[PDB]
Design an enzyme around this catalytic site. Structure first.
Site, PDB file in Angstrom:
ATOM      1  N   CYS A   1      -5.821   3.286  -3.514  1.00  0.00           N
ATOM      2  CA  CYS A   1      -4.666   3.377  -2.622  1.00  0.00           C
ATOM      3  C   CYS A   1      -4.566   4.713  -1.872  1.00  0.00           C
ATOM      4  O   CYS A   1      -4.283   5.749  -2.469  1.00  0.00           O
ATOM      5  CB  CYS A   1      -3.393   3.154  -3.445  1.00  0.00           C
ATOM      6  SG  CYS A   1      -1.824   3.282  -2.535  1.00  0.00           S
TER       7      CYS A   1
ATOM      8  N   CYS B   1      -0.937   6.271  -1.643  1.00  0.00           N
ATOM      9  CA  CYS B   1      -0.541   6.722  -2.970  1.00  0.00           C
ATOM     10  C   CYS B   1      -1.031   8.149  -3.192  1.00  0.00           C
ATOM     11  O   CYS B   1      -0.341   8.970  -3.797  1.00  0.00           O
ATOM     12  CB  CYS B   1      -1.117   5.807  -4.064  1.00  0.00           C
ATOM     13  SG  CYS B   1      -0.596   4.068  -3.955  1.00  0.00           S
TER      14      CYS B   1
END
Length: 103
Positions: free
Chosen positions: A28, A31
């Site tokens: 991700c 993230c």
């Protein structure tokens, strides 16, 4: 610091007071961007709120239980119950606001 949580101990770590759970994954990108923001936020709330991290790849059960479809997803728990949800990258100012609304 941000403590890691897993499917095995989620229910025992969340039963507490107010906690922000970060559902992330190594693949991700957004993230990785919010990671440093959470580390700072954690410090600003030591003794007020706990910030936990849960890798969705190694813990699909908990991710499924709280309908985490896209990540990053952040869920605010209040005494074991989810009370708020934030999706995608967010500035520290916006995350702190969401927490204050439940403290």
């Amino acid at each position: 610091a941000i403590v890691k949580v897993t499917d095995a101990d989620f229910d025992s770590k969340v039963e507490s007071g107010v906690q922000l759970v970060d559902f992330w994954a190594t693949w991700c990108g957004p993230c990785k961007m919010i990671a440093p923001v959470l580390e700072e936020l954690a410090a600003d709330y030591e003794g007020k709120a706990d910030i936990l991290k849960l890798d969705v790849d190694e813990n699909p059960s908990t991710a499924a239980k709280y309908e985490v479809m896209s990540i990053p997803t952040l869920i605010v728990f209040k005494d074991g119950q989810p009370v708020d949800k934030v999706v995608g990258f967010q500035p520290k100012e916006n995350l702190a606001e969401v927490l204050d609304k439940h403290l």
